[model samples]
Target: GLGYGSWEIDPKDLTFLKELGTGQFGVVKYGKWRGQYDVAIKMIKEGSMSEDEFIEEAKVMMNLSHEKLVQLYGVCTKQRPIFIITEYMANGCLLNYLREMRHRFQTQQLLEMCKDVCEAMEYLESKQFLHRDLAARNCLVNDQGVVKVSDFGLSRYVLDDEYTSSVGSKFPVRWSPPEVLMYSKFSSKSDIWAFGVLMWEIYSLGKMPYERFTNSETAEHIAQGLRLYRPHLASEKVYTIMYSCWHEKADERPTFKILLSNILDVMDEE
Candidate 1:
């Protein structure tokens, strides 16, 4: 998708240490930059997407800059495929860590994780940005327990509540609000719906929605506007907070500010 004059990354220049993961956009390679710092480089496959689309998405990712958000260090576009370099996260994703070692964290530590995500969302709202896809997989935790939201390709800036588009509209329906899944008229409320899913992810430790249901069955229910039920063993206080986020009516959903307040309230009650 890149032009001839765009930036280029020579494979020889980079020491391909290992593969981090893969996404629709590209494969992430854990590599050393200039033989000094560790970097996670996302390589977007060229000839697989339109140039305009690639650049626009890159612009969206570049605009996001928060301590709780993954930093986009630089990019290389002149190569056959485009590459985006970011600071390497040692702990991988919170979901994996939670799944592999749930016993390692206490209830208070879980509350802290929720608080960290709240802070990131609050910062994004302050910057007038929306993370269209907010999920546990997109959140990374450092060894210090600080959580950061990553993967900004689906992020966007909206000056008003009037604009609408279907592009990049694909969302995991189980995690998306009913309104957003049906009409694609996403707003802050839609984000709240996603927050509920993230909470479930934390509570369940990386298990996917409808893990017991077949893919076809899940699709049928999603199409019928049926919502997934929270696990019974889920923390009562945590469930209460998530219920507030899962309110069917968009307007009924709390803002990030209120969500933050609820985080503290729920933890205190617990």
Candidate 2:
């Protein structure tokens, strides 16, 4: 009944209100669509042959509709350059939210948020999609306390990107697992490794990972078996799930399905 990449929209209907923030490829704005539908519009900063390449994959990403993912309603390639209208989260991204509102989160709240994100990933995993960027910053949260994955369509679309760690491709080095940093491979398993690091981010109450290490340092450390320490807020059970996400080999990492099961076990008592 529907599609993306081809759901080409009219740019005239999009209204940009305020600059939410800028990302690796473009700017994100808090805005509304015609008839006042609240949304966040993520756009390509500029266009070129490569940028058009980005829109090509929008069809797959658009069909990725799940409650846990911030839904992409439509894309505007006509009327203007390429841009997407996606659901807006009132509380903004998880990283800054946890950092600024750290005091507001309790163990119970943290576990629930983790559960939601993992469930979202589980859905994508079933579809055989890789969320090249799965981390605190890439996760959108709201006052309702739900966690939604952002950059679903473009995470794998952008050029100079992962899918191939060519020198031009980019990744959040600290959040990346050894395979990702060392070999530049992207897979559902690698994203599961990322899921673990994301758990670390949550338990640490938004503290940046590898805070003392540079990206280069992190690569070496991760290669040499360096892993993030357990968060004080995490009990032994919780930390176990996080540690399992960091197995030296991607094969050793748990599937999002299994990870969710273990996390749910952890969630039960807390």
Candidate 3:
């Protein structure tokens, strides 16, 4: 319904090869566009999003371009099932990949994955985008062993680098910051908080953060100054950085650039 870019391709030119998975936003299918490019087709059912909503999302994708961020090929929104085409990530979701193949990778390699995400988050932060949902599950790994940030269903563009929702919003409680869990306020700092939990997820090889705690319990614990224990694979130095991200005061948290430097230093030591 908006001006189509060269990124747009005819739906007839796309061929589905297999079903990838489904989520709250849409179903993802493995497919080839123009019978040449391998791509992941994310299809949203009609009525799931208004034209305005779809266009907003398209604008966000169109504005972003980074190697550590998934590439948006194009979109088709006029039909029943709106499609958002992106490059296929051969290794699939980072969480599942780590759960199945963590042992195959060295500690440095896993940390490298963490760095890749930090780099991407840094890029998003500089662009004034809040990756409201940052987690291992939301990242994808390419066949080249590179991890890229994906799944922007909860992301938002902001001018002041912060977003305050009048209505409540749902988020992965375990990875959220105190402000988000308590007040629906979000910012790049909140993303940093989630990034810390993501680091825990990576070091723990995809174990759920706060394994036995419910959302309410997790919130209460955070208020009481409780944080995730140092992941088994994390050194005390690295764990310190993770812990810093969970600081009760958002301003006290490390910025992504600082995180990138700290993690790189840690990688060099190991």
Candidate 4:
């Protein structure tokens, strides 16, 4: 295989720690790399991606300089397919944390979690990068309540002039924007759209917001101009912030800076 960067592991090197997760595209194996960092190695099944895609993922991960996003330490591609070695967060995804902490946290704890998410998103925006996929499941939360966005495989550096394709991970119905289904492109506005849904997830402590509808059904509703509304219990200010971001027109959404400001204001009220 044509490898672009240094890989710290051999195909047979990993002492499989645990099967962290399995997705349509790959399997996440919790393992140790280089007798050093504990990492979640994504072993993409052979034939699942082109070499270009693999390299592209590495490029994105390699270039990432944010603490809020997962950091790529190295990769191993000597064998068929590829294995990505990256920093590991023991608490795993926000979904898992919230599920486990459902009855343990109060409103203040939830707000702090949301604050962590907002800080990470703001950092991404500062770099002019759109996470493209920002949901609780794509976030890693620790015991301290820090949130880090992961899975940059779907991310793209934003361009003011270029348009993007509509195909990708299906409407995380619970956190998708109305325009994503109505129109055929995504921008930073798309990120804003999902942030709104994230508010729901944090508030509900992992409940599926639009559970009544199938993913496609929810997409159809947004395509027809309906926006996902937050539950009454979600923080009023935070809920309002999400509503503003989920505007049907992408341009109408607030910048991350403004969103951060609003978040601070809301936190101040408490």
Off by over 4 Å in 1: 1-13, 47-51, 54-60, 153-171, 213-234, 267-270
The candidate, 2 or 4, that scores higher on TM-score is: 2
Q: What lDDT tens digits, residue by residue, belong to model 3 across residues 12-128?
A: 888999999975456999998778779888886554455465566766777788889987787876687778788799989999988996357778888899899999998988888
User: Residue-wise lDDT of candidate 1 within 20-40, one digit each (tens)?
Assistant: 787545688888866877778
Clash totals, every prediction: 3, 1, 0, 0
Please identify which of the two predictions, 1 or 4, would achieve the higher TM-score against the true structure: 4
Maximum-lDDT candidate: 3
Per-residue accuracy of model 4 over 155-184 as CA lDDT, tens digit each: 342221211334333435556676665564
lDDT of 3: 0.81
| Per-residue lDDT over 1-270 for candidate 2, one digit per residue giving the tens place of the 0 to 100 score | 113334666677677889988765678898877746788777766642255556667667777888889887777766444677778888898888889863577888888888999999999999988788789888998658798888753555455445335332345787677776777777887788888889999999999899898777888998899889989988888999989989988898899999999989877765
- Cα-lDDT of candidate 1: 0.70
Worst 10-residue lDDT window for candidate 4 reads: 156-165
Look at candidate 4 and give me any clashing residue pairs. none
User: Could you tell me the lDDT of residue 98 within candidate 3?
Assistant: 88
Cα-based lDDT at residue 110, candidate 1: 73
What lDDT is reached at residue 258 by model 2? 97
Clashes of 4: 0
**lDDT, model 2, position 30:** 85
Candidates' C-alpha lDDT: 0.70, 0.78, 0.81, 0.70
Estimate the overall C-alpha local distance difference test score of candidate 4: 0.70
